[PDB]
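Job type: complex structure
Entries:
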Amino acid sequence: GEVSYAKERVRLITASGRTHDLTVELAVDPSQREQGLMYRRQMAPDHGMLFDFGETRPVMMWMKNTYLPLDMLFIASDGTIRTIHENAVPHSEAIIDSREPVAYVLELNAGTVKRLGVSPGDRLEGAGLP
Amino acid sequence: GEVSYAKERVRLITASGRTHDLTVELAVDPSQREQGLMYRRQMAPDHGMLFDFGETRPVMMWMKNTYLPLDMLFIASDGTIRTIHENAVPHSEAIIDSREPVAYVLELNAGTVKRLGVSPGDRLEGAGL
Ligand SMILES: [Cl-]
Ligand SMILES: [Cl-]
């Protein structure tokens, strides 16, 4: 049938203590993680996709077939945001490497990191996290 | 400046032991309490506003300039939910009384109390509760 994703409420917590909720689709399967947000033409400002690699290891992301400009947050197993790549470029096959082992990647609309005042070292929290 | 409130994670804890997390904005001076949730057209199911009266006394609420239907929970200083008025009516000037003295009111989307299985006697916990 139609591809489905588990959804969940997560929150970004910043160093200032500010909290902001998001609704994310969980990309768990290999096909879900590879398809990512390909072909989607819209996505609400507080919605994103949380890629759950099921292990801690470096990861590689790209923008192949992706129309929405995105911010990418590379996240440790304890929810710490290690690095952030803002304004990934639609359609680009340039690899964006995590540069170090991580457990998750959060993709949000481009500009979301700025809108929410998020920085590396801030945290994502939710059901499995930390 | 953009209107802001201190914004907190709080948790409803039912008598049966179930927990439900929320993020609430804190209305803590007279102007904030009198204007809390006016104008808003949308609010997530797990969001609300916590009105902090700075003391324990009878309180009075209404729905002037309020577009969202809301559930009101009247809460003691220790976080115990004393009474609940579900399904307050957008724009209604009807005055909703705690009757007894309380320290807080939590406003949620209408129907939230029923959806979460919350009752009088249940508890709200957070930083400060
Ligand atoms: Cl801040
Ligand atoms: Cl779409």
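Summary: The two ends of chain B are 29 Å apart (CA to CA). The longest strand of chain B covers residues 47-57.
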